[PDB]
Design a protein around this ligand. Sequence first.
Ligand SMILES: Clc1ccc(CN(Cc2ccc(Cl)cc2)c2nn[nH]n2)cc1
Ligand SMILES: Clc1ccc(CN(Cc2ccc(Cl)cc2)c2nn[nH]n2)cc1
Length: 263
Amino acid sequence: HPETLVKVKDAEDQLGARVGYIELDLNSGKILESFRPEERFPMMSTFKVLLCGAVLSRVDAGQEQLGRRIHYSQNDLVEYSPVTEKHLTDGMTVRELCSAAITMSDNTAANLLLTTIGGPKELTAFLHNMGDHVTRLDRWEPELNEAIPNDERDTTTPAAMATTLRKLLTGELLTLASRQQLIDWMEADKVAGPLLRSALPAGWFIADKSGAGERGSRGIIAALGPDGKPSRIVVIYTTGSQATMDERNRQIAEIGASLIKHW
Ligand SMILES: Clc1ccc(CN(Cc2ccc(Cl)cc2)c2nn[nH]n2)cc1
Ligand SMILES: Clc1ccc(CN(Cc2ccc(Cl)cc2)c2nn[nH]n2)cc1
Protein backbone atom coordinates (compact mmCIF):
# COMPACT_ATOMS: atom_id res chain seq x y z
CA HIS A 1 0.00 0.00 0.00
CA PRO A 2 1.51 3.40 -0.82
CA GLU A 3 0.98 4.49 2.79
CA THR A 4 3.76 2.11 3.71
CA LEU A 5 6.13 3.78 1.20
CA VAL A 6 5.41 7.00 3.07
CA LYS A 7 6.91 5.32 6.15
CA VAL A 8 9.89 4.06 4.14
CA LYS A 9 10.54 7.57 2.90
CA ASP A 10 10.02 8.93 6.47
CA ALA A 11 12.75 6.42 7.42
CA GLU A 12 15.18 7.72 4.84
CA ASP A 13 14.59 11.27 6.26
CA GLN A 14 14.92 10.48 9.91
CA LEU A 15 17.81 8.00 9.49
CA GLY A 16 19.71 10.09 6.92
CA ALA A 17 20.29 6.92 5.00
CA ARG A 18 19.28 4.82 1.92
CA VAL A 19 16.50 2.25 2.63
CA GLY A 20 15.50 -0.49 0.11
CA TYR A 21 12.10 -2.18 0.61
CA ILE A 22 10.02 -4.68 -1.20
CA GLU A 23 6.82 -6.72 -0.66
CA LEU A 24 6.21 -9.82 -2.76
CA ASP A 25 3.04 -11.90 -2.96
CA LEU A 26 4.29 -15.27 -1.83
CA ASN A 27 1.95 -17.26 -4.09
CA SER A 28 2.64 -15.51 -7.41
CA GLY A 29 5.78 -13.49 -6.76
CA LYS A 30 4.09 -10.31 -7.93
CA ILE A 31 5.71 -7.20 -6.52
CA LEU A 32 3.17 -5.47 -4.22
CA GLU A 33 5.22 -2.42 -3.16
CA SER A 34 8.89 -1.47 -3.69
CA PHE A 35 11.40 1.24 -2.84
CA ARG A 36 14.89 1.15 -4.40
CA PRO A 37 14.20 -2.52 -5.28
CA GLU A 38 17.17 -3.01 -7.59
CA GLU A 39 19.75 -1.06 -5.64
CA ARG A 40 22.41 -3.09 -3.82
CA PHE A 41 22.85 -3.29 -0.07
CA PRO A 42 25.13 -5.48 2.12
CA MET A 43 23.35 -8.78 3.09
CA MET A 44 25.16 -9.13 6.38
CA SER A 45 23.78 -12.10 8.36
CA THR A 46 20.77 -12.32 6.10
CA PHE A 47 23.12 -14.30 3.78
CA LYS A 48 23.00 -17.25 6.27
CA VAL A 49 19.61 -18.36 4.96
CA LEU A 50 21.01 -18.60 1.46
CA LEU A 51 24.03 -20.46 2.81
CA CYS A 52 21.92 -23.03 4.61
CA GLY A 53 19.74 -23.38 1.53
CA ALA A 54 22.89 -24.32 -0.39
CA VAL A 55 23.76 -26.68 2.46
CA LEU A 56 20.29 -28.27 2.22
CA SER A 57 20.61 -28.63 -1.57
CA ARG A 58 23.74 -30.74 -0.88
CA VAL A 59 21.91 -32.79 1.66
CA ASP A 60 19.20 -33.44 -0.97
CA ALA A 61 21.88 -34.36 -3.53
CA GLY A 62 23.46 -36.72 -0.92
CA GLN A 63 26.70 -34.73 -0.82
CA GLU A 64 26.06 -33.72 2.81
CA GLN A 65 24.46 -35.12 5.96
CA LEU A 66 22.88 -32.90 8.60
CA GLY A 67 24.13 -35.24 11.28
CA ARG A 68 27.82 -35.07 10.08
CA ARG A 69 30.01 -33.64 12.89
CA ILE A 70 32.33 -30.75 12.23
CA HIS A 71 35.40 -30.12 14.35
CA TYR A 72 37.19 -26.77 14.80
CA SER A 73 39.66 -24.83 16.93
CA GLN A 74 40.06 -21.76 19.08
CA ASN A 75 41.68 -19.98 16.14
CA ASP A 76 38.61 -20.66 13.89
CA LEU A 77 36.45 -18.56 16.22
CA VAL A 78 35.64 -15.09 14.93
CA GLU A 79 33.64 -12.27 16.56
CA TYR A 80 30.11 -13.16 17.68
CA SER A 81 30.06 -16.89 17.93
CA PRO A 82 27.73 -17.47 20.91
CA VAL A 83 27.03 -21.20 20.24
CA THR A 84 30.28 -22.26 18.47
CA GLU A 85 32.43 -20.91 21.23
CA LYS A 86 30.75 -23.43 23.56
CA HIS A 87 31.64 -26.47 21.51
CA LEU A 88 35.33 -26.32 20.87
CA THR A 89 35.86 -29.82 22.33
CA ASP A 90 32.56 -31.28 21.16
CA GLY A 91 32.34 -30.15 17.56
CA MET A 92 28.82 -29.57 16.09
CA THR A 93 26.75 -31.26 13.42
CA VAL A 94 25.90 -29.61 10.17
CA ARG A 95 22.31 -29.24 11.37
CA GLU A 96 23.44 -27.66 14.66
CA LEU A 97 25.66 -25.23 12.69
CA CYS A 98 22.79 -24.09 10.50
CA SER A 99 20.58 -23.68 13.53
CA ALA A 100 23.33 -21.58 15.20
CA ALA A 101 23.92 -19.49 12.01
CA ILE A 102 20.25 -18.72 11.35
CA THR A 103 18.67 -18.65 14.80
CA MET A 104 21.56 -17.01 16.67
CA SER A 105 23.63 -15.29 13.89
CA ASP A 106 26.67 -17.31 14.91
CA ASN A 107 29.57 -16.07 12.66
CA THR A 108 31.99 -18.96 13.15
CA ALA A 109 29.15 -21.42 12.34
CA ALA A 110 28.54 -19.65 9.05
CA ASN A 111 32.26 -19.82 8.23
CA LEU A 112 32.40 -23.55 8.98
CA LEU A 113 29.35 -24.06 6.77
CA LEU A 114 30.85 -21.88 4.06
CA THR A 115 33.76 -24.29 4.08
CA THR A 116 31.54 -27.38 3.64
CA ILE A 117 29.93 -25.98 0.46
CA GLY A 118 33.06 -24.58 -1.22
CA GLY A 119 33.10 -20.98 0.14
CA PRO A 120 31.57 -17.68 -1.19
CA LYS A 121 32.37 -18.53 -4.77
CA GLU A 122 30.25 -21.67 -4.54
CA LEU A 123 27.40 -19.97 -2.77
CA THR A 124 27.40 -17.39 -5.53
CA ALA A 125 27.35 -20.10 -8.19
CA PHE A 126 24.46 -21.85 -6.33
CA LEU A 127 22.45 -18.59 -6.49
CA HIS A 128 23.27 -17.91 -10.14
CA ASN A 129 22.17 -21.50 -10.95
CA MET A 130 18.71 -20.95 -9.35
CA GLY A 131 18.23 -17.81 -11.33
CA ASP A 132 19.59 -15.12 -9.00
CA HIS A 133 22.09 -13.31 -11.20
CA VAL A 134 22.55 -10.31 -8.83
CA THR A 135 23.22 -11.55 -5.28
CA ARG A 136 26.94 -12.19 -4.55
CA LEU A 137 28.97 -13.40 -1.61
CA ASP A 138 32.66 -12.59 -1.81
CA ARG A 139 34.02 -12.75 1.72
CA TRP A 140 33.85 -14.69 4.90
CA GLU A 141 32.85 -13.52 8.41
CA PRO A 142 33.47 -10.98 9.70
CA GLU A 143 34.86 -8.96 6.70
CA LEU A 144 31.66 -9.50 4.64
CA ASN A 145 29.91 -6.91 6.86
CA GLU A 146 32.35 -4.05 5.99
CA ALA A 147 29.69 -2.18 4.02
CA ILE A 148 32.08 0.12 2.13
CA PRO A 149 29.93 2.64 0.27
CA ASN A 150 29.50 1.58 -3.34
CA ASP A 151 31.22 -1.75 -2.86
CA GLU A 152 29.26 -4.59 -4.59
CA ARG A 153 30.99 -7.40 -2.65
CA ASP A 154 28.64 -9.37 -0.44
CA THR A 155 25.52 -7.54 -1.59
CA THR A 156 22.02 -8.29 -2.74
CA THR A 157 19.09 -6.10 -3.76
CA PRO A 158 15.62 -6.23 -2.12
CA ALA A 159 14.25 -7.57 -5.44
CA ALA A 160 16.92 -10.29 -5.89
CA MET A 161 16.73 -11.40 -2.27
CA ALA A 162 12.92 -11.44 -2.18
CA THR A 163 12.64 -13.57 -5.38
CA THR A 164 15.41 -15.93 -4.13
CA LEU A 165 13.73 -16.44 -0.74
CA ARG A 166 10.41 -17.18 -2.42
CA LYS A 167 12.03 -19.79 -4.67
CA LEU A 168 13.94 -21.28 -1.79
CA LEU A 169 10.83 -21.68 0.30
CA THR A 170 8.23 -22.57 -2.36
CA GLY A 171 9.83 -23.71 -5.62
CA GLU A 172 11.12 -27.22 -6.40
CA LEU A 173 14.78 -26.30 -5.84
CA LEU A 174 14.82 -27.96 -2.43
CA THR A 175 12.90 -31.03 -1.36
CA LEU A 176 9.79 -30.61 0.72
CA ALA A 177 11.72 -31.87 3.71
CA SER A 178 14.55 -29.36 3.10
CA ARG A 179 12.13 -26.42 2.67
CA GLN A 180 10.51 -27.35 5.90
CA GLN A 181 13.82 -27.50 7.79
CA LEU A 182 14.96 -24.19 6.34
CA ILE A 183 11.62 -22.56 7.25
CA ASP A 184 11.83 -24.12 10.77
CA TRP A 185 15.22 -22.53 11.41
CA MET A 186 13.86 -19.14 10.24
CA GLU A 187 10.69 -19.40 12.46
CA ALA A 188 13.07 -20.09 15.32
CA ASP A 189 15.13 -16.92 14.93
CA LYS A 190 16.14 -15.69 18.45
CA VAL A 191 17.35 -12.30 17.36
CA ALA A 192 14.57 -10.50 15.49
CA GLY A 193 11.81 -13.19 15.54
CA PRO A 194 10.76 -12.64 19.24
CA LEU A 195 10.33 -8.88 18.50
CA LEU A 196 8.27 -9.50 15.41
CA ARG A 197 6.20 -12.13 17.16
CA SER A 198 5.41 -9.90 20.16
CA ALA A 199 4.41 -6.94 17.88
CA LEU A 200 2.21 -8.86 15.42
CA PRO A 201 -1.24 -10.30 16.33
CA ALA A 202 -1.31 -13.73 17.87
CA GLY A 203 -1.50 -16.57 15.43
CA TRP A 204 0.57 -14.80 12.73
CA PHE A 205 3.22 -16.85 10.92
CA ILE A 206 6.75 -15.31 10.95
CA ALA A 207 9.95 -16.81 9.60
CA ASP A 208 12.83 -14.30 9.27
CA LYS A 209 16.52 -13.57 9.29
CA SER A 210 18.06 -10.17 10.19
CA GLY A 211 21.51 -8.68 10.00
CA ALA A 212 23.51 -5.63 11.07
CA GLY A 213 26.89 -4.47 9.85
CA GLU A 214 29.20 -1.60 9.91
CA ARG A 215 28.03 1.96 9.05
CA GLY A 216 24.55 1.57 10.42
CA SER A 217 23.89 -1.21 7.91
CA ARG A 218 20.98 -3.52 8.81
CA GLY A 219 18.36 -5.60 7.16
CA ILE A 220 15.86 -8.33 7.37
CA ILE A 221 14.14 -10.87 5.20
CA ALA A 222 10.80 -12.37 6.18
CA ALA A 223 7.89 -14.61 5.20
CA LEU A 224 4.76 -13.73 7.09
CA GLY A 225 1.02 -13.92 7.16
CA PRO A 226 -2.09 -14.31 9.29
CA ASP A 227 -3.46 -17.53 10.76
CA GLY A 228 -0.30 -19.60 10.80
CA LYS A 229 0.51 -19.46 7.06
CA PRO A 230 2.81 -17.00 5.27
CA SER A 231 1.34 -15.07 2.33
CA ARG A 232 3.99 -12.42 1.68
CA ILE A 233 7.74 -11.93 1.57
CA VAL A 234 9.12 -8.59 2.90
CA VAL A 235 12.68 -7.46 2.50
CA ILE A 236 14.18 -4.32 4.12
CA TYR A 237 17.79 -3.14 3.87
CA THR A 238 19.48 0.06 4.97
CA THR A 239 22.93 1.46 4.91
CA GLY A 240 24.84 4.66 5.79
CA SER A 241 22.80 5.83 8.77
CA GLN A 242 24.53 7.52 11.77
CA ALA A 243 21.33 7.22 13.85
CA THR A 244 21.37 5.45 17.23
CA MET A 245 20.17 1.90 17.23
CA ASP A 246 17.04 3.18 18.98
CA GLU A 247 16.16 5.53 16.14
CA ARG A 248 16.94 2.77 13.66
CA ASN A 249 14.62 0.31 15.51
CA ARG A 250 11.77 2.82 15.79
CA GLN A 251 11.84 3.42 12.06
CA ILE A 252 11.73 -0.32 11.34
CA ALA A 253 8.78 -0.50 13.74
CA GLU A 254 6.89 2.26 11.85
CA ILE A 255 7.39 0.53 8.53
CA GLY A 256 6.12 -2.76 10.01
CA ALA A 257 3.12 -1.07 11.56
CA SER A 258 1.97 0.29 8.19
CA LEU A 259 2.58 -3.09 6.53
CA ILE A 260 0.17 -4.76 8.90
CA LYS A 261 -2.34 -1.90 8.97
CA HIS A 262 -2.76 -2.01 5.19
CA TRP A 263 -2.38 -5.79 4.83
CL1 LIG B 1 16.45 -6.30 21.12
C1 LIG B 1 16.87 -6.03 19.68
C2 LIG B 1 17.39 -7.06 18.87
C3 LIG B 1 17.87 -6.85 17.56
C4 LIG B 1 17.83 -5.54 17.03
C5 LIG B 1 18.43 -5.21 15.65
N1 LIG B 1 18.39 -6.37 14.73
C6 LIG B 1 17.07 -6.81 14.22
C7 LIG B 1 16.67 -6.10 12.92
C8 LIG B 1 17.65 -5.60 12.02
C9 LIG B 1 17.25 -5.07 10.76
C10 LIG B 1 15.87 -5.02 10.44
CL2 LIG B 1 15.40 -4.31 9.20
C11 LIG B 1 14.90 -5.53 11.32
C12 LIG B 1 15.32 -6.05 12.55
C13 LIG B 1 19.51 -7.01 14.38
N2 LIG B 1 19.56 -8.12 13.63
N3 LIG B 1 20.86 -8.63 13.63
N4 LIG B 1 21.60 -7.75 14.44
N5 LIG B 1 20.72 -6.76 14.90
C14 LIG B 1 17.29 -4.52 17.82
C15 LIG B 1 16.80 -4.75 19.13
CL1 LIG C 1 14.74 -3.63 15.31
C1 LIG C 1 13.32 -4.10 15.16
C2 LIG C 1 13.01 -5.44 15.49
C3 LIG C 1 11.66 -5.80 15.50
C4 LIG C 1 10.63 -4.89 15.19
C5 LIG C 1 9.19 -5.47 15.08
N1 LIG C 1 8.03 -4.58 15.03
C6 LIG C 1 7.06 -4.63 13.88
C7 LIG C 1 7.59 -5.08 12.47
C8 LIG C 1 6.85 -6.04 11.70
C9 LIG C 1 7.17 -6.41 10.38
C10 LIG C 1 8.33 -5.85 9.80
CL2 LIG C 1 8.70 -6.13 8.34
C11 LIG C 1 9.10 -4.92 10.55
C12 LIG C 1 8.73 -4.54 11.87
C13 LIG C 1 7.74 -3.78 16.06
N2 LIG C 1 6.72 -2.90 16.04
N3 LIG C 1 6.75 -2.20 17.26
N4 LIG C 1 7.83 -2.68 18.00
N5 LIG C 1 8.44 -3.68 17.21
C14 LIG C 1 10.94 -3.56 14.87
C15 LIG C 1 12.29 -3.18 14.83
